[PDB]
Amino acid sequence: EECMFKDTRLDVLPPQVNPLNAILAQHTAQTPVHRSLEKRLWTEVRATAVSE
């Protein structure tokens, strides 16, 4: 009843959770493993492309 005469903003703060972790997790859960290794190949070939 006396909520107006208090300051509980410290008792209730916004969480520091990154939703990107849940997004990449759902992405890995949807993708297979051979595509992950393919993406490692895409990155390696992109590195050689930037090199040349």
């Binding site: 909520c3 703060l13 916004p14 990154n18």
Partner: protein, 57 residues
């Protein structure tokens, strides 16, 4: 007794009383509504959007 009377049932004097009373009430409504609540002060003070940033690393 005096108030036991059919004349006092539709008394025009009391009807004028009611008329003037509620005309003045209608005139002064916008001053009766002029009380302040402190709820939007609370909402401004306590509403805190998520200020954390995204960091993939």
């Amino acid at each position: 007794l005096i108030p036991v009377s059919l004349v006092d049932l539709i008394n025009i004097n009391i009807i004028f009383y009611i008329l003037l009373l509620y005309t003045l009430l209608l005139f002064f409504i916008p001053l009766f509504l002029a009380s302040i609540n402190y709820t939007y002060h609370y909402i401004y003070k306590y509403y805190n959007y998520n200020y954390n940033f995204i960091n993939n690393n």
